[model samples]
Target: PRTPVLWLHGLECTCCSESFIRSAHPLAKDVVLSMISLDYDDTLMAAAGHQAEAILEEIMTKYKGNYILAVEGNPPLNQDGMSCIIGGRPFIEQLKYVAKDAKAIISWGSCASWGCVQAAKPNPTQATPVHKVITDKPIIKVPGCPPIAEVMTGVITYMLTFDRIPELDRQGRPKMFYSQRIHDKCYRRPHFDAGQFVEEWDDESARKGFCLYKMGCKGPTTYNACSTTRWNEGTSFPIQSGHGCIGCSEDGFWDKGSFYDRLTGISQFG
Candidate 1:
């Protein structure tokens, strides 16, 4: 039998779900139905109310500690976690309950990996990442604003095939995909090395497809497969489209100041 998977959502806008459904590598359908048994996913499954919630318990009992817990968002601890609810309970409660029987947990996006926008400055809900809350389990952080569809699919494939988690970087990301910086593989690397930059939005260099570092391209520091994997069946990435990367894959990206600023506000020591 295929490994069962339990997907949960918290305080999120569902962008990760949007990106996940677009997996083009082996197709989301193959992964959902054939490769792994996606027994419960509120976003994709039609069941709701107690009917849907009951699946969680059933999976826990049947699969025991063999299933994967994939979380799509962060949990808000403020107001007793009233900011997000599932099955009439705070998201945190359900997260911890389901996590207790999980073999491993996949933090699906920046929200679950690094708190994303919900944990930005003056975070009212005290939103917390999955690793911080689910301390006992092995948490694999696939951080992106929503992450690339191919990368998301790749991670699941590795786990299902190997029956073991992929090698991870220090940040708990799969090293096979996150080991390289986007800048290292960016098509505009030659322009950056040549000091060709788009000084202004409508400048000649911008029209000619120059580097966006001066306009806050985070590709140099950001670790992701965007430059290599591309998006939408390897069509194009942000840099190829004449726009700078916002560094969505990194930690604390939302609190790092203006997206157009050249220098990242974060310190290496922090």
Candidate 2:
């Protein structure tokens, strides 16, 4: 109950951290201040350099095997682990050293969970996911191109309140949020079942809110809470905005081919 977690970031644009701050309901500040005594976070911490380093060392020693390690991005394995460094050390080394005694781990977004854009085609840095790089620990992956704000908070809260990891899917993502496909809870699913779909952007079907499966909507194959919880205060998601889901939550979505291609005969795996 005294707080025991250290949040770290790797090869990323810090978008996940940005998204975490923008939580509309159950705001991120409440979650951090009340749930976990976040000891170190480079992007938000007030301390810097040697001061931050000292805090990290102190916390890890104080908490020992009781702390959580939250990671925000993948690590580049191609450069002898030198592609990304923090506190003058390779991220991979820092990760392994810190995670050695963590009670558990959390992969904050697609970058940490699914490798994001860094792991896309021709990835010279060889951006490998956290699970791939850190194999000895249990990691809860709250994956999304950038995860929904409340969903992100909920995962951490569940962990803190329960004093253990939340129930997870086969991939180690929380089942409460990642268990259902966007298609399963979609408003336009009826249209999809009836073989109705939007053929083009902003067409009559679009106005009618028909299913965008024909336009490469990954709802059928992608899983997550986008449809149920919605985004920006439950207003709308990508489908409601006239574009389809590119299945951003799934792995390597950026390399998964045309965003507007039809669903075809593929099965829903998200």
Considering every candidate listed, which one attains the maximal TM-score?
Answer: 1
Query: Which lDDT tens digits does candidate 2 get at residues 1-270?
Result: 656779998999898888788786667777777767888898889999899989878988889878889899878888887899887778988888888888898999999998999899999899989998788997899999789887887787787778878888888888999999998889888888887778877889889999888889888878889999988678788877878899989988888788977766844422
Error of 1 at 169 (Å): 0.7
Expressed as tens digits, the lDDT of each residue in 1-270 for candidate 1 is 999999998999999999988887889888877998998887878888989988999999999989999999889999988889776789999999999999989999899999999899899999999999888888899999889998998999999888888999999999988998898889988888787889899899999999898898888889999998899899999999988999999999887778899864523301
CA lDDT, every model vs. true structure: 0.90, 0.85
Highest lDDT, which number?
A: 1
Number of colliding residue pairs in model 1: 0
TM-score of 2: 0.94
Q: What TM-score, computed on C-alpha atoms, does each candidate reach?
A: 0.96, 0.94
